[PDB]
Amino acid sequence: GSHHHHHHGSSGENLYFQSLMKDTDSEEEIREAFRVEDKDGNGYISAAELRHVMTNLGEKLTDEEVDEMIREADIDGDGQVNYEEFVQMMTAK
Ligand SMILES: [Ca+2]
Ligand SMILES: [Ca+2]
C-alpha cells in the first residue's frame, strides 16, 4: 500500500544509493553509533557491524549483497570503512 513497487523497472534508481548516505538524526547520534558499532573498539566498522545498522533499520541483505554493497560503498575500496570515511559516508552531500 504505502510502500510497494518492488519491481526492478528500467529506471536507474541510482539516486536510491544516495538516500542511504542521507537521512540522519543528529551528528551526535552518528558519533555515538560509531562507538556502539565498534564493540571491539577496533575503531573500524566491519560487515558484521555494518549489518547491525541495516538490521536495526529492518533492512535485510544477503551475504553477497553485503560484500558488493560494501565494495561499492567503500570509496577507498579498502574493503573496510574508516572513521574519517564513515563520517563522510553519512555526511556525504
Ligand atoms: Ca568495530
Ligand atoms: Ca574505506
Swiss-Prot record:
Signal peptide: none annotated. Residues 25-60, 61-93 form the EF-hand domain. It comes from the Eukaryota. Ca(2+) 3 binds at residues 38, 40, 42, 44, 49. Calmodulin acts as part of a calcium signal transduction pathway by mediating the control of a large number of enzymes, ion channels, aquaporins and other proteins through calcium-binding. Calcium-binding is required for the activation of calmodulin. Among the enzymes to be stimulated by the calmodulin-calcium complex are a number of protein kinases, such as myosin light-chain kinases and calmodulin-dependent protein kinase type II (CaMK2), and phosphatases. Belongs to the calmodulin family. This protein has four functional calcium-binding sites. This is Calmodulin. The chain holds residues 77 to 149 of 149 of the full protein.
